[PDB]
Structure formats: structure tokens, C-alpha cells
């Protein structure tokens, strides 16, 4: 099993860990901030997914410094993760294209 597939697998596991830790820590950052909506675990988890995929729905977002710090890590993990799957598919196609010219 090639590096690029191990890495994509790793990045998926690591992103799901980031989405759960992020759920938990967003609620922990945002409770105590009057007006905050990112304060129960289930919608925190939905929030973490729409943040990682950079969907920017705009139904939920953090209003505190530590919530926003948590948000930044989730976004970076999401963009890296999905970038790494792209790199992995590039490698696969470059390989399949070497072979298809008998290199």
C-alpha cells in the first residue's frame, strides 16, 4: 500500500479526530459568551464539518477568541486533508500515465 493512500487514510482519521475534538472545544470556548449559538455538542459537530469543508453556510460560527482559534485549526485540517486526497489522486494518475507510455 503506497504512501499517498496511507497518507489519505491517515488524513481522514486525523480530520475526524479534529472534527470531534473541535466540536467539544468550540462548545467549551463559546459557552459564557452572551449571544453565542455554538454551545451544544451535536450542532457543534455539524459546525465542525461545514467548517472543515469550508461550506460557510452561515447558520453557526464562533464569537470568542478561543472559538475562532479552534475554528482556524478545523479549517486548516479540512483544507490540508482535502488537498492531500487531491495530491494522492494526482500521484495515482501520473503513475497510470507513466505505465501507459511504457516508462
Amino acid at each position, epitope marked *: 500500500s503506497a504512501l499517498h493512500w496511507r497518507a489519505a487514510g491517515a488524513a481522514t482519521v486525523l480530520l475526524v479526530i479534529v472534527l470531534l475534538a473541535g466540536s*467539544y472545544l468550540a462548545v467549551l470556548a*463559546e*459557552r459564557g*459568551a452572551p*449571544g*453565542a449559538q455554538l454551545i451544544t455538542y451535536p450542532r457543534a459537530l455539524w459546525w465542525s464539518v461545514e467548517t472543515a469543508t469550508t461550506v460557510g453556510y452561515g447558520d453557526l460560527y464562533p464569537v470568542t477568541l478561543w472559538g475562532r482559534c479552534v475554528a482556524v485549526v478545523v479549517m486548516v485540517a479540512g483544507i490540508t486533508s482535502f488537498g492531500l486526497v487531491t495530491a494522492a489522486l494526482a500521484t495515482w494518475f501520473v503513475g497510470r500515465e507513466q505505465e501507459r507510455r511504457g516508462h
Partner: antibody
Amino acid sequence: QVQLQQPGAELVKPGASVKLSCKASGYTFTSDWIHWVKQRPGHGLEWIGEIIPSYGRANYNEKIQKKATLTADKSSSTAFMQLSSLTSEDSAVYYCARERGDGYFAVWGAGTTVTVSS
Amino acid sequence: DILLTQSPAILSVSPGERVSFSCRASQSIGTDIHWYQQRTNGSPRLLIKYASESISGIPSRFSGSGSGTDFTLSINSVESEDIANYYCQQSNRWPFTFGSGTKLEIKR
């Protein structure tokens, strides 16, 4: 089972403080928040504050004079509320309740009647 | 902070009749409203969560409806054991807040 056990009563001299206890049983999660709610006789429910025992962070009602300090003992599954410098304004039933981090008080203690009097 | 208005404060009904308790939020809170029953000398008891969801242990007689700002807890065919104060509570925005309460009173 009784999920939340509170002492029936505390008498407190005016000016003095008191620690209320709240010993939890049944399922405990990392996610669990313990809340405290004040009810004066013939009056409604007043949210005082919350603590997350797994991390020990606490938040308080801004809109009222801060009387309370919340702590928890991870090992003995007990949450504490230190009410300090009481007056007759502070005479009330104090409920503890458990929230699974999903927004609603699944279960309440039976409440501690706190009387401030000489 | 979200204000929950429960008007009227007292609701009189005859035995076996249907009754509706109102809860109005000062801004939209979707379906993040939960309802408690508190009998005389008793602690609160969760009846309905997220505006409409059953709790096991609660008579089918109880139901909830509403979204946004206007929420209703209903009892089809009231009976004596329903005599209590009924409170609403929001979890949309920090901090959680309670309605001022509505007493049910039966005219027998």
C-alpha cells in the same frame, strides 16, 4: 435510582457563606454540564451557572450579583456551589440539574432549601 | 439574552378539556425550547424537548409545537395530576433562560 443528591437544607447567618453539594450517579460523560437554579418562594426558576466537571470550566449568569463559585470533584462525582456573603435576598431553593451538552435539563436534584437568618 | 414570555400566568380549564400554554421568545430560536412541569414542593420535570419531542415516561396527553418565536405546550384532556406550574427554557443562545411560568388551574 436518584441521579442527583442534594442536602435538604442549610441555615446560614447573614454575611456568612455556604458550600452546596450535588452528588451525581447513573451515566457520566466527559460532555456532562452540571447547572444550578435558584427559586425564591412563590417565584420562578433563575439560572445561576454551569460547570463542566471533566474540564472544571464554569460560567455564570451575568445579569445577577455574583454570589456563587462552582467547583467539582472528578473522583467523587460531586459538584459544589460556594454562595458567599449571603443576605435574605439569597434565601431560596437551589436545584442542581444535569445537561448532556444538548440543551435541556434531563434530570434535577430535589433541591437545597437555604435560609439566611440569625 | 433571550427573554421567554409565558402569557397568561394562570390558565383555568374544566376537566377533560384541551389546554395550550404559550411561550414567546424575544428573537428566533428555531426549535430549541424545552418544557418542564413543577408540582407544589416538587422539582422540575422535563416534559417536551426541542419544541415537540416526546420524553419516555411522559403521558401521550402532552405535546409541543412551534418554531422561531411562538411555542405551545398542549395537554389533550386535562386531569387533576396536571395541576402544576409549567416553564419553558431556551438553549439556542448563551445563557440558557427560563419563562416566568404558567399555573394550570382546573374548574371542577
